[PDB]
């Protein structure tokens, strides 16, 4: 039998730990500081940043989803990143 002490000891050096129900629950619940910051952005900027560096789509695909050229998706992306960097003073709480 694999020991609970052994399961935990192994979890100490693994890319994902023995996660609890509470951790999963919180991860499935809103991250209020982040959700409010994203909702502060305008629709186009929030959508560009979400598609770009939350879902990780390539820029041509982000274009094809929002049917705008690549340059203006890149514009919306860099400027929404700036606006969110301003909006998130809780980076210092997490950085």
């Amino acid at each position: 039998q694999i020991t609970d002490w052994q399961l935990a000891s192994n979890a100490e050096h693994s890319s994902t730990g023995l996660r609890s129900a509470e951790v999963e629950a919180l991860e499935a619940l809103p991250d209020t500081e982040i959700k409010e910051a994203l909702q502060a952005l305008p629709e186009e900027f929030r959508m560009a940043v979400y598609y770009a560096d939350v879902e990780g789509f390539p820029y041509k695909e982000i274009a094809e989803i929002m049917d705008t050229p690549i340059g203006t998706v890149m514009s919306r992306l860099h400027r929404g990143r700036r606006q969110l960097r301003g909006l998130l003073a809780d980076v210092a709480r997490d950085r």
């Binding site: 935990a8 100490e12 050096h13 890319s15 629950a25």
Partner: protein
Amino acid sequence: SSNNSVPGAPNRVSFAKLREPLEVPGLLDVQTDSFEWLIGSPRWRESAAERNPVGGLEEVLYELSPIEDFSGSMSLSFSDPRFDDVKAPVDECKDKDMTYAAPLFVTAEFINNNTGEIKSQTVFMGDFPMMTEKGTFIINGTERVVVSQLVRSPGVYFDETIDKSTDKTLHSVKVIPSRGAWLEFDVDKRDTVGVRIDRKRRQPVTVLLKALGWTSEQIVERFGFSEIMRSTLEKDNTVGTDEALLDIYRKLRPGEPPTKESAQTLLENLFFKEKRYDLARVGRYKVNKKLGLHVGEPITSSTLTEEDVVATIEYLVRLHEGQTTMTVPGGVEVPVETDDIDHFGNRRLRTVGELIQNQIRVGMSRMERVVRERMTTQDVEAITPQTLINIRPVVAAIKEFFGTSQLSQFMDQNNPLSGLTHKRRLSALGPGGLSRERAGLEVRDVHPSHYGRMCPIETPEGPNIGLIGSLSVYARVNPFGFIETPYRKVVDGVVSDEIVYLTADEEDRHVVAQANSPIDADGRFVEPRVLVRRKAGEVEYVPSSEVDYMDVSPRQMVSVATAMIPFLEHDDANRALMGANMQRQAVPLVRSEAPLVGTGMELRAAIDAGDVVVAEESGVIEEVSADYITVMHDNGTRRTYRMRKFARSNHGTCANQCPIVDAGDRVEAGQVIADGPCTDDGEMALGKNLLVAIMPWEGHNYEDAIILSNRLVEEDVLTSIHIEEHEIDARDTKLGAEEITRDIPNISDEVLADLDERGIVRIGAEVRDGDILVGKVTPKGETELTPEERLLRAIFGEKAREVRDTSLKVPHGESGKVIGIRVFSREDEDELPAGVNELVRVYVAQKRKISDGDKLAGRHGNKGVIGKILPVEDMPFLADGTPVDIILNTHGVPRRMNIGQILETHLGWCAHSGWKVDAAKGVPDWAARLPDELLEAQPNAIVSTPVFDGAQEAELQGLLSCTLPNRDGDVLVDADGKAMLFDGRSGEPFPYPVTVGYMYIMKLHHLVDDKIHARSTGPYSMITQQPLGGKAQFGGQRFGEMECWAMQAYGAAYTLQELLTIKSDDTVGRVKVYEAIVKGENIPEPGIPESFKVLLKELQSLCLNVEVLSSDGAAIELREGEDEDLERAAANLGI
């Protein structure tokens, strides 16, 4: 009285009346004698001279050498075992996770007879682990003890078992050596005598008799008197010699073509060939005294001889008639009887040195295989004593032994007494011993031969009862492995001072008196008729002319811990076992305080335990610091003893040595220079002297609960120090090496304020639950970043590798001061396991006060937990304002049969107050017998009540009269031991005199802090998806089967379902339930337990097509969705 065999030892005045003619031997001798034999120390040799000296190693080497090849050409022989110095000191091995070992060399001499050449050489065998001065080993950093193992001695053993059906008295005999193949002889329901060899089928004994060379008439001549042998020979299948060898081989190897000559060779190799069969000198002496062979004391060879086989067969067939006597050719008037498996003349113990030798031998033989293999595959002139010898199997054998044997154990170091008894234990289980499923009830009973050898009191209450005993005080193990005990020789009626050590064997031939026996001052049995014991627990009165030996001392039957219970003989054996066991669970307190009431055993148990620092040689204290002590001998040489300061024991108690000498002081050899964890001025001090009242108090001490004065908190009298060692390593993982860093993700600069630049908590920090002790991060992988983490990393352009926080935090409910940091690196040259890069241990110290829920106990099995700690003003107090310290409920005493605790209390009061018996107009009658220089005592005097020789009842009652008063001339405790107490709560006096006095109370290592535990949610087992187990793992309580029956009997269906699905096993219901509670809405409906799906998968793995059907009769799909949550993830990111 003086106990002055130890220099500088405190003056503990003794109530004893009998004189001790012998001193307690070195209590660690059981281990030092054994290991110093194994090694062949000079000391051991000298001892041998006083008593053919060979050492355990020398014995292995002479048995193994010479090593000849198959052609008899080249011979290798091992000559001399020697040792180098130790590689590193003990504390250095402890700090660096090493093994305290010394290099072992041997002299390897190779001869080639074909060329006539000789090549000697010094060959290194390995790093042989060493026993300390304290009788222990350091293995991979941790301290360990090798417990002595109770085995059945090599020999020949006959037992009588009634037949299963026929109700006939059957007899069996087992010939059992120290190494080799078993032999057995058994008579069946039918009257055929049979031989069973290595669990094979029972062939007729005639088969073996004819295979040995005995012809049919040669057999009928000897065994003809027993119609059992004639009946089994008439019923024998075949008659002849080589046909008998053929049948032996046929039954010995199944699926094998038999051959006559190879049968001859195999049979001569099994029992008579000294190569692979050996009953040691123990077995040879046992069989020779058992059957009467070789009584001219020849100990030349130790092997199964043919004549021994014939003698055992005849003994069995004559025991089937049960005649009280027998004689063999040259035999000597041998008694015929069955053997007692549990008698300590047939049950020996393999000590540490022999246990080690038995693995050394295995390794050496595995190496001899390679020696014989290399002698053929190598160029005959190019070989050397270094090319043959491969020391890998020997090193592997020693390592395996110390690392996996049941008998190599984690030393329990709660306090010195723990380790002292642990070194003295006799354990019944282990390899070569008896197994736990075969541990009947009779091996666990107190056996009459245990008297003076194995203490009948100290043993565990739970599943190991009667399997773990401890050696008796005066007992010593003989070179054969039998336990002897000393006795005074009584010549014709006078008790001389000649001490003779008898085994349990030699004891049954004599008769033994008691230490309680009157004698005139010159020496003669003034007692007219004695009460004695002989074999099988005899008890009989007898004239002193027939008494051969007498006990050297009371407590001779008793172990160290048992001999420390004052008034033992007033305590029933159950609570006394409880007191012996609980002494070894006392925690060391910040300040140690010897008992006012003790026995003569405290001092001598501290010294021998080893945690006390003792002067090797007389001298003057040249320097004293908390850090070390330097004594300048009269030699001119110096000696310096470094103090262990706040070391962590194996069990988390604080080992803190403290100097008790001053600069300029004169100390003699053997004097204690510094106190250890539970010692006070050289004596073992496991607890505190507490002012006790025996009375119920408002139910707060109901049903064994204990009430404490808050003084014990304020004045730190039951405060202890506890040190945890939190260890964490940075190692190589599937996504790259981990790094010990101060850069922790998702953490603010605030929570890292107590860390240093590298990420380790700073020395001296106060730490609480969850405080980082060592920051660490583990490579994570982009797919494992949360959407919030991915957003944050993108926005702020964090190019740092994605990691998850795997820091070492402070575990729930623990707190303390960081005492020390220790770190090992791979960048530096530091021995680390493979893939392990950085290692760091943070040591945390907590100062635990006594609390509600802690466990306390006296020495008489009187245990309780603390129910309430009252303010000083609430305690019942004496007439002068003194509040009592501890309130013990009256209802607990009488039915447990331990009024020792009460008697102690009385004596505790007397010693606390001091007394002066009148002695004007003559000394009184009660004081006439014992007291002498006990006629008076100064307050807080230190006295001893030796077990079975302590303070008599009348003398105890007498002291209660002449008690000295307090500072106002008031006698606070009357002649019954009772006192008038005021209720501190109201002020009214309690209506009746309450017994008060002083009692030694111990803080047992069962404390609330260690035991409180609660979990809302935590880790889960990967196999079953159920909560992990154990406080250490933040586990959940097991709601077991009987608990579910309880829940069912209530009809509490929903509670039972919720316990069995969402609280453990339902992996989606867990999360949805925590989510519901956090969001303030109703708890949802359970899902399916994951362990049911695991069961189905195991059944399918057994080729069982288990499906689950619906009402329709259609198999149900037991899987979950893929995108079951897509809407709410966007909702949570606000899109």
